[PDB]
Symmetry: C5
Subunit: 103 residues, 5 copies
């Protein structure tokens, strides 16, 4: 089991770490059919999504996807500093696999 | 996959973007049978609903509807600025499909 | 579809409106068997319940009943001003059907 | 249907009301197998549990037990004054049936 | 039934109490397949996980595992003092069984 976000992300092909050290600049969420997703941006221009749940996901991931959207919303509203995001770079916008927060 | 609320909105027939750049003025919620819904308003007079779940909604939208009501409630209680809403303008009040929050 | 709490409330028999314009004074909840409910009070002495879920409630209402109790708890904790309640007056205490909040 | 915690409590055998009028001093929760429970303490040394779900609870209590643990966590974190707890006194620690908050 | 975290922890093999008396330094959450987990850190260098759910967990633990991740997130965002953690020390990072907060 990895002990940090960087090591976790390195377990996956098609992932990279973005180091933001910044609060989330905007938060977007959609309930439209086939676009049940969230999109966040940062002041530097980065745009990331939480993917629409789908065939690329195993059943163990469905609760986690819902948790990640909960996390991003509350981070946005508390202005919480996002340290790193582990993201899939084989999707546009890049898709969030993991997030770390620190003061 | 779209990169913002505007492009997302444009993927659907009968939707429109409203730009509010304002906090939610009022939040209303009902548990009454056949009226399990939320209604928000803005200072400018805009009134928007999250629809009662029914046959216009595919199963994947169900969770997303419940999430949208959570988001609108907490956005209200935190006085969070709403940037844009993507809505179905074929319903009265207009029905929320997506929301973006930013300053 | 109604556009406000008053018009919603009018769609049902045995309901009335209270206009509190005040924060919730007290919040109570219970997990005891057959009494899985919440009760709220206002400074003016009004007492209201979210009913125990039951045969009088259609399946679509079950999720809404849970949400209502979530809303009341967070409204209480943030000292959010309640504008109006729509309640059923054929129950004792009067039972909440819908709520509106505005600053 | 009762109108307050004291009357609700009096509808059950092996219950009593504690009147704390204080915030929760400590919050403990466990995910360990067979001890999926929460424990609260008050500064006066009183200790209470939310029981591990079990055959002593009817299905309708299952959601309400989960709500109670949510309520105690957020009360702890917001330093909300707990007015009274109704508890079953044939358990050790005494088991929470209901809570009121006021202040 | 135990009355505190130290006694609860002692009912299990391969556990120990860590006494932190400090807020969470970092919170990390992942939705990546087979790594649906959370990791927290403390200023002192301690790293702990909430395990990916697996065959080492019974059905009654599933909801509590989701609850714990909810608790850690909100503890982190509130800068809540964590008193103790009961952890499995035959996992790396050590795996959270129970948490107590007090300040
Ligand atoms: C920083 C890092 O870890 N790795 C690389 C990487 O980063 C760029 C790559 O993700 C491309 C993919 O198109 O997007 C660039 O950002 C765009 C923004 O694109 C949006 O945000 C990213 C993160 C993706 O989700 C993408 O799908 C989104 O559309 C766009 O919104 C606008 O801001 O323009 C920038 C490019 O200027 C990534 O660039 C990196 O992040 C941006 C925000 C900015 O900080 C750049 O300075 C930074 O490089 O690939 C690039 C390729 O040049 C480099 O190798 C990075 O080192
Ligand atoms: C009785 C008691 O509470 N602790 C013992 C115990 O503690 C050390 C032990 O848990 C080892 C792992 O076997 O880890 C040491 O911490 C590492 C950090 O490791 C991470 O956090 C711990 C808690 C585990 O989850 C581990 O899997 C994680 O990797 C590591 O991140 C880095 O910071 O280095 C430290 C020190 O090696 C535990 O050490 C204790 O806790 C740390 C935070 C610090 O306070 C240490 O000074 C302290 O000893 O075992 C040691 C003997 O190894 C002592 O008996 C403790 O009393
Ligand atoms: C973005 C866009 O295309 N806007 C055009 C649109 O806006 C009006 C329509 O959306 C109509 C359709 O009913 O409602 C108008 O607003 C009413 C308001 O309606 C409630 O809120 C709107 C957003 C809808 O969800 C309705 O279903 C709701 O009932 C009433 O509650 C209010 O009392 O009165 C206003 C009219 O003043 C929309 O008005 C626009 O948005 C409002 C909030 C104001 O900003 C107003 O100035 C705008 O015009 O249709 C108009 C036609 O005049 C324009 O073409 C807009 O571009
Ligand atoms: C109110 C009391 O508080 C503590 O002393 C517990 O050990 C008792 O069992 C009871 O819960
Ligand atoms: Ca700010
Ligand atoms: Ca702000
Ligand atoms: Ca901080
Ligand atoms: Ca204000
Ligand atoms: Ca006050
Ligand atoms: Ca306000
Ligand atoms: Ca204080
Ligand atoms: Ca207060
Ligand atoms: Ca601080
Ligand atoms: Ca405090």
């Amino acid at each position: 089991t990895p002990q940090n976000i960087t090591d976790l992300c390195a377990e996956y092909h098609n992932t990279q770490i973005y180091t933001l050290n910044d609060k989330i600049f905007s938060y977007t969420e959609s309930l439209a059919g086939k676009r049940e997703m969230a999109i966040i941006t940062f002041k530097n221009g980065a745009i990331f999504q939480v993917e629409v749940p789908g065939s690329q996901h195993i059943d163990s991931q469905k609760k986690a996807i819902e948790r990640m959207k909960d996390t991003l919303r509350i981070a946005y509203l508390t202005e919480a500093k996002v340290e790193k995001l582990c993201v899939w770079n084989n999707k546009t916008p890049h898709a969030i696999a993991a997030i770390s927060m620190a003061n």
